[PDB]
Ligand SMILES: [N-]=[N+]=N[C@@H]1[C@H](O)[C@@H](COP(=O)(O)O)O[C@H]1n1ccc(N)nc1=O
Ligand SMILES: [N-]=[N+]=N[C@@H]1[C@H](O)[C@@H](COP(=O)(O)O)O[C@H]1n1ccc(N)nc1=O
Ligand SMILES: [N-]=[N+]=N[C@@H]1[C@H](O)[C@@H](COP(=O)(O)O)O[C@H]1n1ccc(N)nc1=O
Ligand SMILES: [N-]=[N+]=N[C@@H]1[C@H](O)[C@@H](COP(=O)(O)O)O[C@H]1n1ccc(N)nc1=O
Ligand SMILES: [Mg+2]
């Protein structure tokens with residue numbers, strides 16, 4: 001069959017992955033539908049030595065649409081829509097290097113693609129049969145983002161905040177937030193909005209059933 | 211010869227003090243001078259009982275709640291300043307959460323600026339202000355500034371800072387500060403960076419002090 | 424000899440048109456005159472396809488969404504007005520949800536006011552404005568004004584009005600209009616009733632037109 | 637035993653009664669705790685013929701603290717806290733008349749007292765062992781209030797709105813909203829905030845159990 005591709009966007013630490021996890025979990029509550037969640041973060045571009053030098057100095061914008069391998073995203077997603085098995089790269093964010101190992105993703109009935117810029121490119125955007133944007137208060141997101149980067153990346157607090165003000169927040173307002181208008185459903189308060197998520201799940205189930 | 215009281219509000223680390231400072235500096239650049247004094251709501255915290263200080267040590271005291279401040283003393287102080295009287299302002303030790311014996315003498319001035327997250331909360335205090343300004347700054351910009359302020363305090367954990375913010379500061383802002391925003395004369399987006407708005411406010415103050423243009 | 428463009432935003436029935444009207448009237452009272460024209464975003468709705476009009480008849484078309492407006496035509500029109508050109512403005516029939524054949528000629532002016540709930544949404548349009556104002560009015564005050572406007576339309580059900588508001592108008596305001604509020608130079612609480620704020624804005628406009636005080 | 641008195645306040649159509657119903661319903665989910673919900677609207681004062689004339693002309697403020705029989709409220713609530721059976725008046729809002737029939741309320745383990753001005757009087761406020769304030773967007777509340785009054789009171793639309801602007805909204809900002817500072821828990825989004833309500837229920841259960 002043909003997979004049902006769902007695109008999920010939203011600002012940093014807005015709860016995109018939590019909303020996808022909730023969707024899969026509620027899909028199984030109601031044979032079973034196979035569901036897989038993909039992340040745009042897996043498709044960061046391979047950096048040159050100069051770009052990696054700027055990144056280690058905190059001078060590379062990883063929130064700009066150019067930072068993502070949009071060509072690899074488009075090709076991976078188009079092969080999924082045609083029902084094939086694909087290989088997903090494994091990107092190391094602490095070292096800014098795409099690892100050699102890949103992850104095999106077998107065909108599923110529903111595929112969720114989440115990322116801060118999932119709706120930016122028009123070609124990938126037209127592949128999504130449903131599009132969701134996760135909305136969360138900017139300070140709530142920042143404090144999640146700060147705790148997340150302190151532990152998962154081991155970075156300094158002052159350097160996290162200066163990176164946020166320099167790159168993350170401006171790129172959100174210039175590149176991510178405008179893609180909100182392409183969303184079929186906008187979800188305020190993220191995964192805690194179980195009412196909205198339940199409507200989305202019921203909509204997904206009715207499209208697959210008939 | 212009546213002091214001109216200006217109330218300044220806005221969320222934590224929105225720029226209330228910087229806006230007050232910019233107004234003071236701009237008022238002096240166009241002097242042909244004016245006595246200007248700045249008061250802060252943070253000087254009027256209540257003295258905590260030993261029961262309350264115990265909860266405070268466990269991070270279970272809401273310092274952002276209206277009850278945390280001496281609203282009676284705020285009103286009495288600002289009313290006397292309005293009448294041209296000289297007032298005594300307490301000094302508050304935040305480590306001890308108590309008031310030192312020494313007070314600060316504050317003399318009347320041409321312009322008195324009072325800044326506070328809850329400056330507009332009480333109706334009696336709000337009516338004392340002949341001009342009211344609200345500083346509107348992005349929440350994540352404010353949180354970044356607020357974290358850097360609090361973290362400079364020695365032995366103040368970051369996860370303690372962020373959890374106090376999520377539990378007390380953000381809810382108190384939404385529930386007690388934001389409903390008063392409607393009462394301002396002018397709302398200043400982006401804080402002290404908004405000089406077109408601040409220049410208009412300063413020009414309006416100069417013309418009130420001069421009895422006209 | 425360049426027209427001075429002012430962008431005005433704020434939620435539904437916040438007072439955008441009244442604020443524009445008050446600015447026009449106050450600019451003429453202190454003339455020693457200035458040509459001022461007012462444009463509205465509601466003139467730039469897109470023509471609806473027969474598929475879209477069908478959903479509109481079932482109350483399932485979002486007229487508050489950014490896609491409902493001709494952003495290309497808005498930008499092209501305001502860019503030509505900025506250059507001092509004369510523009511043709513469409514006329515929109517709301518019953519038919521289509522554009523009449525007749526257009527309205529709009530000549531350049533000293534001051535051009537553009538008002539719209541989504542006036543600041545697009546970055547290209549937002550940068551054309553040399554001054555940006557946001558009108559901040561209580562939501563229940565706005566809803567009361569909005570219901571009385573819509574209910575005067577013949578055969579327009581009240582429960583249809585309120586459900587269109589809850590489904591489309593309020594969410595679009597929170598998700599598309601409010602994030603642009605930060606870009607305004609001045610935020611006007613309580614709308615056209617705020618004459619201290621409006622007087623400051625008018626005085627600032629007069630001084631830009633005069634090249635100084 | 638002694639009943640556990642809970643006071644619930646909030647603006648018009650904020651969901652106060654819906655929050656009380658949800659609390660009772662979740663209390664029984666977890667012998668059983670007997671719970672009763674009382675409404676401040678039952679204790680409107682008996683109007684004189686002149687006051688009733690102004691009310692029929694739309695010139696009486698039913699949102700002012702003086703409109704409620706605070707003496708009867710205090711006495712009814714104090715007798716409840718001492719464990720007695722009380723009689724609750726039955727007020728007719730369309731006619732502004734207290735009916736002669738009363739409702740018998742037998743002792744319960746938990747008593748919820750909801751009303752726009754439940755925390756206004758300090759004497760009634762000190763009787764509440766827990767205090768809750770329900771927060772909801774003003775336009776959401778107005779549209780609920782409008783539909784509610786169109787049907788339950790049969791009033792004209794223009795007269796509902798003018799009453800709201802003249803009395804309801806100003807009295808909310810002057811009398812109701814300031815009592816928010818007495819609340820132990822503030823509930824944004826009303827009954828839809830099942831996370832906050834669950835914490836309240838668990839707190840109630842732990843106070844009753846031990
Ligand atoms: N910096 N920065 N911001 C980006 C994005 O905002 C976030 C995307 O996902 P999200 O968690 O915001 O949803 O990843 C961060 N990233 C990317 C590569 C790397 N080597 N280190 C990182 O930190
Ligand atoms: N926690 N907390 N919040 C409060 C207020 O929100 C902020 C004042 O407002 P502002 O400076 O943000 O304008 O001070 C914090 N405070 C209070 C006492 C203390 N011993 N240490 C503190 O940190
Ligand atoms: N529905 N709705 N919302 C829209 C907008 O929110 C409002 C414009 O903004 P404003 O007048 O509130 O400033 O017009 C309404 N509209 C649009 C088309 C039509 N045929 N009838 C209407 O009523
Ligand atoms: N008018 N008015 N406002 C009041 C209050 O706002 C509301 C209290 O309860 P709430 O539903 O706002 O929670 O009752 C209304 N009332 C009272 C007596 C009467 N004879 N007719 C009424 O309509
Ligand atoms: Mg993620």
Ligand SMILES: [Mg+2]
Nearest residue numbers: 226227250325
């Ligand atoms: Mg300060």
Ligand SMILES: [Mg+2]
Nearest residue numbers: 439440463538
């Ligand atoms: Mg208009």
Ligand SMILES: [Mg+2]
Nearest residue numbers: 652653675750
């Ligand atoms: Mg009720």
